[PDB]
Amino acid sequence: VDNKFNKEMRNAYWEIALLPNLNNQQKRAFIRSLYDDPSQSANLLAEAKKLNDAQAPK
Numbered sequence: 373v374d375n376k377f378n379k380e381m382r383n384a385y386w387e388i389a390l391l392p393n394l395n396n397q398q399k400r401a402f403i404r405s406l407y408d409d410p411s412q413s414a415n416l417l418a419e420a421k422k423l424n425d426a427q428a429p430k
Contacts, residue, residue, distance in 0.1 A: 376410075377410055380410045380411075380413055381406060381410060381413060383413065383414075384406075384413045384414065384416070384417040385403075385406065387417060387420075388402045388403060388406075388416065388417060388420045389403070391420055391421070391423075391424040393424055393427045393428050394420060394423050394424055394427065395423075395427070398420075398423055402416050402417075402419065402420045
């Protein structure tokens, strides 16, 4: 695949898995979504944080 994939994901990838409160399917979902559309990587990462904030206590 074109280098563009690696260059874009470098900005957002492991950070998605960093959140420990995201459900099993939720974690795998975002990482899978990256392949589906890397242009949304910025959105997916923010979206992951959204679920993290939501499920997080307090």
